[PDB]
Design an enzyme around this catalytic site. Structure first.
Site, PDB file in Angstrom:
ATOM      1  N   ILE A   1       0.799  -1.230   0.000  1.00 44.01           N
ATOM      2  CA  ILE A   1       0.000   0.000   0.000  1.00 44.01           C
ATOM      3  C   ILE A   1       0.833   1.283   0.000  1.00 44.01           C
ATOM      4  O   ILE A   1       0.392   2.313   0.514  1.00 44.01           O
ATOM      5  CB  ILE A   1      -0.991   0.057   1.196  1.00 44.01           C
ATOM      6  CG1 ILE A   1      -0.245  -0.008   2.534  1.00 44.01           C
ATOM      7  CG2 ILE A   1      -2.022  -1.056   1.096  1.00 44.01           C
ATOM      8  CD1 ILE A   1      -1.149   0.120   3.750  1.00 44.01           C
ATOM      9  N   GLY A   2       2.030   1.230  -0.577  1.00 40.38           N
ATOM     10  CA  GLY A   2       2.855   2.420  -0.701  1.00 40.38           C
ATOM     11  C   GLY A   2       4.170   2.385   0.057  1.00 40.38           C
ATOM     12  O   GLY A   2       4.428   1.467   0.839  1.00 40.38           O
ATOM     13  N   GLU A   3       5.003   3.396  -0.179  1.00 43.54           N
ATOM     14  CA  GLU A   3       6.307   3.499   0.466  1.00 43.54           C
ATOM     15  C   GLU A   3       6.465   4.816   1.211  1.00 43.54           C
ATOM     16  O   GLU A   3       5.559   5.260   1.917  1.00 43.54           O
ATOM     17  CB  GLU A   3       7.429   3.366  -0.565  1.00 43.54           C
ATOM     18  CG  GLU A   3       7.756   1.940  -0.955  1.00 43.54           C
ATOM     19  CD  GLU A   3       8.646   1.855  -2.180  1.00 43.54           C
ATOM     20  OE1 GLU A   3       9.105   2.913  -2.659  1.00 43.54           O
ATOM     21  OE2 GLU A   3       8.880   0.730  -2.667  1.00 43.54           O
TER      22      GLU A   3
ATOM     23  N   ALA B   1       9.192   6.428   3.764  1.00 42.24           N
ATOM     24  CA  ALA B   1      10.376   6.532   4.606  1.00 42.24           C
ATOM     25  C   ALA B   1      10.225   5.745   5.909  1.00 42.24           C
ATOM     26  O   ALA B   1       9.226   5.899   6.612  1.00 42.24           O
ATOM     27  CB  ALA B   1      10.657   7.994   4.904  1.00 42.24           C
ATOM     28  N   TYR B   2      11.207   4.902   6.233  1.00 44.43           N
ATOM     29  CA  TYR B   2      12.356   4.643   5.372  1.00 44.43           C
ATOM     30  C   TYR B   2      12.246   3.229   4.824  1.00 44.43           C
ATOM     31  O   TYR B   2      13.240   2.512   4.688  1.00 44.43           O
ATOM     32  CB  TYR B   2      13.662   4.811   6.150  1.00 44.43           C
ATOM     33  CG  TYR B   2      13.629   5.978   7.103  1.00 44.43           C
ATOM     34  CD1 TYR B   2      13.517   7.278   6.628  1.00 44.43           C
ATOM     35  CD2 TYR B   2      13.698   5.782   8.476  1.00 44.43           C
ATOM     36  CE1 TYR B   2      13.470   8.349   7.493  1.00 44.43           C
ATOM     37  CE2 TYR B   2      13.658   6.848   9.349  1.00 44.43           C
ATOM     38  CZ  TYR B   2      13.546   8.130   8.850  1.00 44.43           C
ATOM     39  OH  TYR B   2      13.505   9.198   9.717  1.00 44.43           O
TER      40      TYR B   2
ATOM     41  N   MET C   1       8.844   0.426   2.896  1.00 45.06           N
ATOM     42  CA  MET C   1       7.473   0.314   2.412  1.00 45.06           C
ATOM     43  C   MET C   1       6.468   0.171   3.552  1.00 45.06           C
ATOM     44  O   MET C   1       6.839  -0.083   4.702  1.00 45.06           O
ATOM     45  CB  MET C   1       7.339  -0.859   1.437  1.00 45.06           C
ATOM     46  CG  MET C   1       7.838  -2.182   1.991  1.00 45.06           C
ATOM     47  SD  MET C   1       7.451  -3.623   0.969  1.00 45.06           S
ATOM     48  CE  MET C   1       8.410  -3.295  -0.497  1.00 45.06           C
TER      49      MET C   1
ATOM     50  N   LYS D   1       4.684  -0.573   9.286  1.00 46.40           N
ATOM     51  CA  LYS D   1       5.708   0.318   8.747  1.00 46.40           C
ATOM     52  C   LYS D   1       7.113  -0.247   8.935  1.00 46.40           C
ATOM     53  O   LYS D   1       7.633  -0.263  10.051  1.00 46.40           O
ATOM     54  CB  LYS D   1       5.640   1.683   9.434  1.00 46.40           C
ATOM     55  CG  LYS D   1       4.915   2.764   8.658  1.00 46.40           C
ATOM     56  CD  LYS D   1       5.218   4.136   9.253  1.00 46.40           C
ATOM     57  CE  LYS D   1       4.921   4.164  10.746  1.00 46.40           C
ATOM     58  NZ  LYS D   1       5.470   5.377  11.417  1.00 46.40           N
TER      59      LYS D   1
ATOM     60  N   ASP E   1       4.537  19.307  12.325  1.00 45.28           N
ATOM     61  CA  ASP E   1       4.424  18.909  10.923  1.00 45.28           C
ATOM     62  C   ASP E   1       3.009  18.471  10.547  1.00 45.28           C
ATOM     63  O   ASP E   1       2.809  17.382  10.010  1.00 45.28           O
ATOM     64  CB  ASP E   1       5.429  17.800  10.597  1.00 45.28           C
ATOM     65  CG  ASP E   1       5.629  17.613   9.106  1.00 45.28           C
ATOM     66  OD1 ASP E   1       5.552  18.618   8.367  1.00 45.28           O
ATOM     67  OD2 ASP E   1       5.862  16.464   8.673  1.00 45.28           O
TER      68      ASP E   1
HETATM   69  C1  LIG Z   1      -1.124   3.674   5.572  1.00 47.18           C
HETATM   70  C2  LIG Z   1      -2.324   3.052   5.893  1.00 47.18           C
HETATM   71  N1  LIG Z   1      -2.697   2.915   7.153  1.00 47.18           N
HETATM   72  C3  LIG Z   1      -1.918   3.373   8.124  1.00 47.18           C
HETATM   73  N2  LIG Z   1      -2.024   3.380   9.493  1.00 47.18           N
HETATM   74  C4  LIG Z   1      -0.926   3.987  10.041  1.00 47.18           C
HETATM   75  C5  LIG Z   1      -0.088   4.389   9.072  1.00 47.18           C
HETATM   76  C6  LIG Z   1      -0.697   4.005   7.796  1.00 47.18           C
HETATM   77  N3  LIG Z   1      -0.337   4.137   6.523  1.00 47.18           N
END
Ligand SMILES: c1cnc2[nH]ccc2n1
Length: 340
Positions: free
Chosen positions: A20-22, A24-25, A27, A43, A138
């Site tokens: 479901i994506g990348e 840092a640091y 995927m 993560k 941030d």
């Molecule tokens: C993508 C999808 N769900 C998520 N929950 C915490 C971080 C994250 N990233």
């Protein structure tokens, strides 16, 4: 165990990996938690090569483990090798969130009602963060994870700090960066971010999209108008003052002209959140008490920090070797045989 030619090694508990994506640091993957019998997010993080990377990791972990809020992402579990020598990457398991506000605004014009409860959830979460004497630093649409219209969670506390108005003294995301940062650690910087997020939900585009920090100021002043002598004096730096002059004088663009279709109450709050002077900028509890959020505001259902936050022994100038040890120590409570 293998995902797109890269080891994940989150078994045997977490199975059925998906990509479901990348970022840092490493995927990000959605796995199946065989214990809780539900899909979670994981993560993968490989920060030990660079000192800055270790900071953001250690910083986020220490904070997310101590915070407990409906509007702030939490850490369910942390996968890690038994010995310090062995581990090169850390796995953080969190609740699976379907999308985020950045991806939402790229596909949908938000209704006023949805913008309202979204804004409330952000401020509800922020109130808890600020009560712990902590700055997110941030805040931006991509750091706002969404499941439904009533499921918003704040994420990414890598740049977070403990509030310290007397300091002085790596920067935040330029577009949502408070003007006082660019001119000279206060809670006002987060309020300014939320303001930028409000203005973005109203028109599906960044209000102050500068290329660099000087251009970023040209954008802010281009809408707020030329700052008064009172505001100008608070600028401790010289350049500014003395770069405002040279200034091509501008007038304050009325919020209704910029956002015609927007709720007038929303614009009023927006005006409070996006004031140039940080000392006159609205505070988080005041933002919640604003007439725009009058249908959600409920101090009895808005939890705050049990105790103000302080890192035991901290701050930069620790080499990446010491930070790794502190990361090894902080994630120790997710390991077998963990005493104390
Ligand atoms: C993508 C999808 N769900 C998520 N929950 C915490 C971080 C994250 N990233």
């Amino acid at each position: 165990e293998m995902v797109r030619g890269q080891v994940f090694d989150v078994g045997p508990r977490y199975t059925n990996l998906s990509y479901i994506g990348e970022g840092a640091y490493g995927m990000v993957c959605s796995a199946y938690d065989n214990v809780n019998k539900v899909r979670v997010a994981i993560k993968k993080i490989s920060p030990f090569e660079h000192q800055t990377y270790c900071q953001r990791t250690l910083r986020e972990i220490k904070i997310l483990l101590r915070f407990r809020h409906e509007n702030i992402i939490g850490i369910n579990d942390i996968i890690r090798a038994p010995t310090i020598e062995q581990m090169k990457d850390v796995y953080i398991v969190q609740d699976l969130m379907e999308t985020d506000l950045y991806k939402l605004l790229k596909t949908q014009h938000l209704s006023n009602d949805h913008i309202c409860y979204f804004l409330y959830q952000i401020l509800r979460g922020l109130k808890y963060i600020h009560s712990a004497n902590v700055l997110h630093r941030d805040l931006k649409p991509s750091n706002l994870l969404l499941n439904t219209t009533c499921d918003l969670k704040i994420c990414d506390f890598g740049l977070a700090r403990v509030a310290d108005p007397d300091h002085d003294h790596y920067v935040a995301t330029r577009w949502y960066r408070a003007p006082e940062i660019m001119l000279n650690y206060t809670k006002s910087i987060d309020i300014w971010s939320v303001g930028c997020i409000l203005a973005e939900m109203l028109s599906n585009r960044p209000i102050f999209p500068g290329k660099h920090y000087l251009d970023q100021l040209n954008h802010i002043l281009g809408i707020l108008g030329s700052p008064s002598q009172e505001d100008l004096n608070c600028i401790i730096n010289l350049k500014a003052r003395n770069y405002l002059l040279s200034l091509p004088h501008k007038n304050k663009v009325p919020w209704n002209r910029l956002f015609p279709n927007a709720d007038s109450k929303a614009l009023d709050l927006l005006d409070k959140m996006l004031t140039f002077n940080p000392h006159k900028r609205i505070e988080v509890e005041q933002a919640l008490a604003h007439p725009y959020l009058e249908q959600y505001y409920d101090p009895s259902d808005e939890p705050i920090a049990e105790a103000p936050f302080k890192f035991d022994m901290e701050l930069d100038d620790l080499p990446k070797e010491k930070l790794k040890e502190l990361i090894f120590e902080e994630t120790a409570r997710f390991q077998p045989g963990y005493r104390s």
